[PDB]
């Protein structure tokens with residue numbers, strides 16, 4: 001009855017359940033990772049109800065000792081929109097999802113309107129449609145897009161773009177005429193300005209200059225291209241850039257935020273071409289600070305030298321190759337050098353000095369093969385443009401703070417106020433004077449940051465950094481905890497950064513007389529997707545580059561980046577590749593070996609033998625092309 005029914009329902013609700021994530025491997029039974037040590041065993045027949053990565057509620061089935069979990073509710077499904085390689089016969093297609101841990105092929109079927117005959121091996125986008133835990137018969141996906149075919153060498157670029165639903169083209173750009181508002185655009189032409197960029201860039205978005213002043217003072221002029229002089233709010237090209245947010249840069253291939261006809265010409269600041277530029281005046285001295293000596297003002301220049309980072313850095317030491325032809329550009333290089341080497345001193349004493357992990361560059365043939373993977377050096381000329389840029393992005397942050405309290409600012413809070421006392425405890429182990437009170441305040445943050453520098457290695461720094469939040473983007477001004485900036489505002493690259501383009505329009509309002517709520521929402525999101533994309537293509541290419549090295553005695557220095565319970569992750573110093581080293585390769589006696597994810601150490605016979613940050617030599621044991629995984633072993 002009613003009666004019987006009601007009883008059964010209550011007996012049903014009160015029964016033991018746990019919520020967790022399914023962790024399957026190449027076995028039949030899996031586990032529900034509940035938490036710290038709670039993991040339940042999921043038996044083979046029950047494994048077929050769920051997918052590795054699914055978040056589920058399970059009924060807990062009572063047994064004498066070893067308990068069992070029976071999948072009952074799907075909380076959060078692992079797959080929704082995904083990519084994979086198609087298989088099967090004409091009318092019975094399946095798709096193996098592109099993920100190390102999901103071997104099983106999912107029945108599928110093309111959408112409405114999709115007409116492509118899905119060959120075998122075809123890469124497809126799919127959307128999950130059926131799940132056994134939703135009362136469905138079995139797993140069912142819908143093929144919604146064709147990416148490319150199986151043997152396609154360009155698989156790495158296309159699949160990555162498709163899985164993140166990123167554009168693969170520049171926006172269509174009808175380039176209409178240039179605009180007018182109240183442009184009292186000045187005249188800094190005659191005075192010879194210089195670009196300092198890489199070898200192959202057809203767009204230089206920045207120019208530089210300095211003046212012979214009287215007593216102990218300098219005068220930097222940062223000159224940045226004017227995209228907003230042509231593009232207008234609402235404009236088609238305005239609305240496409242809003243969607244894209246950032247230029248997506250990948251190994252050998254970029255997806256421009258803006259049409260090339262601006263980038264390469266109209267906005268580019270070439271050689272001896274008159275170009276409408278937005279500039280910034282400033283003065284520095286022996287310590288190096290600027291006050292009410294900064295004006296932001298539209299102008300126009302005729303750049304008189306296209307200058308390469310290495311040629312420039314060659315001369316700023318002495319070498320055998322290059323000489324600046326002019327006495328104009330030559331003296332103007334000495335200018336910017338003294339500027340740079342003095343400007344570093346203000347940020348070491350009032351901010352946070354940078355050590356920006358060495359960008360790796362892929363060198364590819366016209367067919368996509370990896371020839372090499374060099375690491376981009378940070379010589380002096382790089383630190384010249386870096387310095388200038390840094391200083392010149394600073395000036396905007398203040399200005400736009402005073403006029404509006406609007407801007408596109410980058411807000412790094414530092415440590416999560418939750419982990420707050422979790423941290424002052426940690427250092428307390430390491431024996432480090434950290435009052436939980438001050439901590440949060442910038443003064444504390446940056447004073448702690450100093451003490452870390454004083455350490456033998458970067459171990460403790462790696463530790464504490466599991467405690468901070470991520471740099472965000474906001475409309476209000478904030479502090480750049482990570483940079484040591486009071487406030488930070490980017491206008492350095494309006495051509496690649498919508499934020500910097502929005503800043504430009506705000507920077508125009510300054511000279512003259514609020515970016516909407518969800519703008520930052522999708523600016524953050526695109527930067528994430530852009531970062532994952534770049535990383536995923538690189539993972540493919542590393543696997544291809546290193547393949548022939550597997551089983552060989554080639555050694556590679558590798559820094560240990562993360563310790564897990566089953567082993568440790570290293571990044572090869574020379575190329576940046578990430579490899580895994582399983583624990584039975586670290587020591588032959590398992591009970592003698594401890595890997596703590598939580599302590600960033602590996603102990604052998606009670607002692608610490610490796611820690612996050614260490615640099616050891618490794619050989620390449622295995623490279624799995626299907627999954628792009630690289631296994632390494634320490635040199636013995």
Ligand SMILES: [Mn+2]
Pocket residue numbers: 196197204205206
């Ligand atoms: Mn540049």
